[PDB]
């Protein structure tokens, strides 16, 4: 009696389902029925299952209700088994349990169906419920943007002229960043070979394509369906979209055009931070020394607090009302461009059997989606900051300020918000509160949300990366302040537009009781300790710490201690796990190139942040030993040791693998 | 050329292939029709050859509902097309048609401006929305083998 071990499971269950349904249809029929049509009822079950996966409404015109009620039961029964196995397998994949490439491929294929079923529901609800952004809040959002742009004296981006001599240069840049997608392999399908054909024609005859692109903008408003598929990163899934080449070539030019003109116009104020002249770790450096150059910033003599808020605009992309977005875009660009950009998001998404019209949000895979996100983000920055303070951060149109400076010391002190930036959706705010202002702001919070129970100290987010003497002390004043700041910020933003959540944001309070403020800006995290406080020594032990001067006197005043984010560590570990899959892995040099590329992707980004993060150095030693064992198994060897290290680390020009080392191995 | 203009010969095989294979096997239909991909064959059915398309003339209650919804959700044609029950191409074109009549008769002569907004000598981006060429008398080796 051979067992249902593992590979037998799914085929066995589908037998037991159909065998059970056979019993019921025999019993449910009246005793005078024609003793047939049992097989016909089963085929309806198989169809109802397929309709459920495809999200099609299954309905048979003349089917009698005792059979229909039975099938509607068992489809739900199979759905409960099917869904829970997707949950179970995903919670294994994330933690790094024993898995194989088959179940990883299958589980991704289930999750993407489950996503689309939720997504079709969501888009349908919008038309039935009506637009969640009220007709009064929308006008408020729109009017805000108008007064802002008028104050800047912004000159609208025109429709690109016929004689606009830069056009050919912008075309070449567009085509080059299209062709970079095809560097991976020579194996192409029909749709990809058509794309390279169209690219080569555009090179061979630019004045053809430029006339065709411009003819698209003026006239085209109904576009073809776009594919969707998911990149699997284990820890989460990332959508990827497939756009038809002729549309893609027009979008790529348009993206290049808009960003060039917006830069020249100075649309975006300097706090919109993925910037052409600044790598992300340089952002963190300018941020830290940005803090320290503020006036009096470390003083606590009267009882001053500093508060640092990190948050995300949680579901920014997914909410954007196209009817509003069209009018907002029309304030920047020529209306023909605005109409094109809007319409291009209203496209049929397609994945195998499943199709629906997208209509409530933007498509991230469009070539110009990065423009829309930052402009819409700019609309919401004005909500959080308010018109008045945002004009002081950006400064006069004749003479705009850079990233973290103001005209005067006097203008710094005029408002609590001293520093602001937005990365994409991630928000960073730095507040300076005087003695009285901190008290009054707590009281309002407690008036809405009184806590005699001392629940406030319980659910407070704190980072375990640092010792007990280093992480935030939960003093009752500081905790009450920290929550109350977040509450005030959250009120500024309409929930129909966007929202902020306490579970994913983080708050840190510098105070007479807490000497350290933590934050986690980009891929790595840090805490600033001023030298007039608990350190009392001008230490220099690690190279993993930044001494940072006060710009006026060139005295050191604080230390910034770097560490890698826990999330960034997990990202790297999953990339190593991904390398250890696949069948091309037997080709030794195809592995070690992926290991090398991964390792320099970590090290050259984080630099001195690595050595202070002793938890991550242990992971590097682990990952290196695993991949070396993979080479060994390719030569059998198994458990017997004393395998020579020379074969791995010898540079490729001498015929070794050229492995990069990050551990204390010895010859 | 792969794709291109649709002829009458391909349309009769396309109808007959949906009988054999259904509306969820497009790579089995496109293996039966050369110089057309499965993505194009799917689009050709759903936008000019599904008989649910109300190819007749626009009535007055259709136009009145069009003009409202065009004001109501600007440029978002695909969100309008299942509501009024027409193809979005037809929906856009007829809206463009209605605007042209009213503005021209009130202000203009027969043309006045741009006699060639038409695009000679270049490919159309979407000929699935266009009527079909007839079948030539001398069918070649490719079509008869097909």
């Amino acid at each position: 009696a051979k067992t249902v071990t593992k590979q037998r499971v799914e085929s066995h269950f589908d037998l037991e389902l159909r065998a059970a349904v056979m019993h019921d249809i025999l019993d449910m029929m009246p005793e005078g029925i024609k003793q047939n049509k049992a097989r016909t009822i089963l085929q309806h079950l198989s169809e109802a299952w397929r309709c459920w996966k495809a999200n099609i409404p299954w309905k048979v015109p003349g089917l009698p209700t005792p059979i229909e009620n039975m099938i509607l039961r068992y489809v739900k029964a199979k759905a409960d088994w099917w869904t829970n196995t997707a949950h179970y397998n995903r919670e294994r994949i994330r933690r790094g349990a024993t898995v194989d490439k088959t179940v990883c491929k299958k589980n991704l294929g289930r999750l993407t169906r489950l996503y689309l079923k939720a997504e079709q529901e969501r888009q349908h609800n919008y038309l039935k419920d009506g637009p969640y952004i009220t007709a009064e809040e929308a006008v408020a959002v729109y009017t805000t943007t108008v007064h802002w742009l008028e104050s800047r004296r912004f000159s609208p981006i025109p429709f690109p002229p016929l004689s606009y001599k830069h056009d050919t240069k912008l075309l070449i840049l567009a085509l080059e960043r299209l062709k970079e997608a095809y560097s991976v392999k020579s194996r192409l399908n029909q749709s990809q070979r058509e794309e390279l054909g169209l690219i080569e024609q555009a090179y061979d005859n630019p004045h053809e394509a430029l006339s065709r692109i411009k003819r698209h903008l003026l006239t085209q408003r109904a576009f073809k369906e776009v594919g969707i598929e998911f990149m699997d990163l284990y820890s989460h899934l990332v959508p990827v979209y497939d756009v038809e080449p002729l549309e893609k070539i027009t979008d790529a030019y348009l993206d290049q055009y808009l960003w060039y003109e917006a830069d020249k116009r100075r649309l975006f104020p300097p706090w919109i931070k993925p910037a052409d002249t600044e790598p992300p770790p340089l952002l963190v450096y300018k941020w830290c020394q940005g803090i320290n150059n503020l006036q009096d910033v470390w003083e606590t003599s009267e009882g001053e607090c500093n508060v640092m808020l990190e948050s995300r605009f949680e579901k920014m992309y997914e909410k954007i009302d196209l009817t509003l977005l069209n009018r907002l875009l029309r304030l920047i660009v020529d209306h023909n461009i605005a109409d094109y950009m809007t319409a291009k998001n209203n496209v049929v998404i397609n994945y195998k059997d499943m199709n629906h019209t997208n209509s409530y949000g933007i498509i991230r895979g469009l070539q110009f989606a990065s423009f829309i996100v930052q402009y819409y983000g700019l609309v919401m920055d004005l909500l959080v900051l308010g018109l008045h303070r945002a004009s002081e951060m950006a400064g006069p149109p004749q003479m705009p300020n850079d990233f973290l400076s103001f005209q005067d010391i006097a203008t710094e002190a005029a408002h609590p918000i001293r520093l602001f930036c937005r990365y994409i959706d991630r928000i960073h705010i730095f507040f300076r509160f005087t003695a009285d202002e901190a008290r009054d702001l707590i009281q309002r919070y407690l008036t809405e949300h009184p806590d005699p129970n001392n629940e406030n100290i319980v659910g407070y987010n704190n980072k375990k990366c640092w010792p007990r003497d280093a992480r935030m002390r939960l003093m009752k004043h500081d905790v009450n302040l920290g929550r109350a700041v977040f509450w005030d910020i959250k009120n500024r933003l309409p929930r129909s537009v966007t929202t902020v959540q306490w579970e994913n944001s983080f708050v840190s309070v510098y105070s007479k009781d807490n000497p350290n403020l933590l934050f986690n800006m980009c891929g790595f995290e840090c805490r600033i300790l001023p030298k007039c406080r608990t350190s009392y020594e001008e230490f220099t032990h690690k190279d993993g710490v930044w001494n940072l001067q006060n710009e006026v006197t060139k005295e050191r005043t604080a230390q910034c201690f770097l560490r890698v984010d826990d999330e960034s560590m997990q990202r790297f570990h999953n990339r190593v796990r991904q390398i250890l899959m696949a069948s091309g892995s037997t080709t030794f040099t195809k592995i070690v190139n992926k290991w090398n590329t991964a390792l320099i992707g970590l090290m050259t980004y984080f630099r001195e942040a690595v050595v202070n993060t002793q938890e991550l150095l242990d992971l590097l030693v682990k990952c290196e030993n695993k991949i070396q064992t993979r080479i060994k198994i390719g030569l059998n060897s198994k458990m017997p040791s004393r395998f020579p290290p020379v074969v791995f680390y010898t540079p490729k020009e001498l015929g070794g693998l050229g492995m990069l080392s990050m551990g204390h191995v010895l010859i | 050329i792969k794709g291109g203009v649709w002829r009458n010969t391909e349309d009769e095989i396309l109808k007959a292939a949906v009988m054999k294979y259904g509306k969820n096997q497009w790579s089995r239909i496109a293996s039966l029709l050369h110089r057309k991909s499965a993505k194009q064959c799917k689009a050709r059915w759903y936008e000019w050859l599904d008989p649910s398309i109300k190819k007749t003339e626009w009535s007055r209650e259709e136009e009145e509902k069009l003009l409202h919804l065009a004001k109501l959700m600007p440029t978002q044609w695909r969100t309008i097309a299942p509501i009024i029950g027409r193809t979005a191409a037809q929906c856009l074109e007829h809206y463009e048609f209605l605007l042209d009549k009213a503005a021209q008769r009130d202000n203009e002569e027969e043309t006045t401006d741009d006699p060639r907004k038409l695009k000679p000598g270049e490919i159309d981006p979407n000929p699935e929305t266009k009527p079909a060429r007839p079948d030539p008398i001398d069918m070649d080796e490719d079509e008869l083998e097909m």
Partner: peptide
């Protein structure tokens, strides 16, 4: 005449779609 409401509605749509942006003088 206003009895042909479709002609009035079409005229209204033309005026609302084509106007150039408020940041330049109308």
């Amino acid at each position: 005449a206003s009895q042909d409401r479709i002609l009035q509605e079409a005229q209204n749509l033309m005026a609302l779609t084509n106007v150039d942006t408020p940041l330049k003088g109308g």
